[PDB]
Amino acid sequence: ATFEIVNRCSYTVWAAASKGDAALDAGGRQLNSGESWTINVEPGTNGGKIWARTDCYFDDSGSGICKTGDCGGLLRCKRFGRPPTTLAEFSLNQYGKDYIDISNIKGFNVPMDFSPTTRGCRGVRCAADIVGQCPAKLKAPGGGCNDACTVFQTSEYCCTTGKCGPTEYSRFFKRLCPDAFSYVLDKPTTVTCPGSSNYRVTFCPTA
Numbered sequence: 001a002t003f004e005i006v007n008r009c010s011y012t013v014w015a016a017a018s019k020g021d022a023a024l025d026a027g028g029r030q031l032n033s034g035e036s037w038t039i040n041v042e043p044g045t046n047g048g049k050i051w052a053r054t055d056c057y058f059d060d061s062g063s064g065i066c067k068t069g070d071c072g073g074l075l076r077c078k079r080f081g082r083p084p085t086t087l088a089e090f091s092l093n094q095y096g097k098d099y100i101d102i103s104n105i106k107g108f109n110v111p112m113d114f115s116p117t118t119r120g121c122r123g124v125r126c127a128a129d130i131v132g133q134c135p136a137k138l139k140a141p142g143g144g145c146n147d148a149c150t151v152f153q154t155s156e157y158c159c160t161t162g163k164c165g166p167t168e169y170s171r172f173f174k175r176l177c178p179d180a181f182s183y184v185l186d187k188p189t190t191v192t193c194p195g196s197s198n199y200r201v202t203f204c205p206t207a
Contacts, residue, residue, distance in 0.1 A: 003041055003124065004038045005203075006036045007032070018079055023078050026039070054109055058075045086107075086110055086146065092195070098196070099190050100128045101181060105182070109145075112205070121192065135169070148183075166183065
């Protein structure tokens with residue numbers, strides 16, 4: 001499946017794509033404002049994620065650090081990124097279908113649209129001004145808006161034990177972006193697409 005990753009932000013993003021223990025395609029690429037990157041994701045892939053990283057510093061060998069979404073200090077990501085990260089999440093070819101969503105469970109850094117290239121299902125978007133409205137206690141100094149689990153590290157927010165519910169912090173994300181997961185046990189906003197679809201992930205969407 002192809003994923004067209006498009007940066008329409010005023011700033012550079014270092015795109016990342018991983019399934020947690022390995023890169024998807026090249027794993028990462030610098031996208032200056034206006035640039036795109038098309039990757040191939042293998043059929044049947046489960047637990048894939050695409051995200052933006054902001055304000056990265058890499059040397060000639062591809063090593064350094066990003067202010068948001070850093071993946072072990074590498075340009076070409078193998079593993080998932082450090083919060084805060086708006087997440088495009090997908091599993092493909094599961095019982096004949098693809099499953100896509102956007103998640104704020106690990107916070108928000110860059111606005112995102114995640115849409116199929118086919119008419120057979122509907123895309124999702126979280127592009128509200130979460131960083132500008134971020135409660136002070138959730139603000140990340142390097143940019144972005146942390147989820148409450150990252151900040152407070154309690155089950156109330158991290159949903160590690162029992163059955164967590166909405167909190168004032170999950171509600172902050174949910175009201176701004178109803179179509180994205182706001183905490184682990186949020187009512188699902190996963191979209192079912194025809195199996196073997198292709199997709200576009202747009203940073204800073206408008207139209």
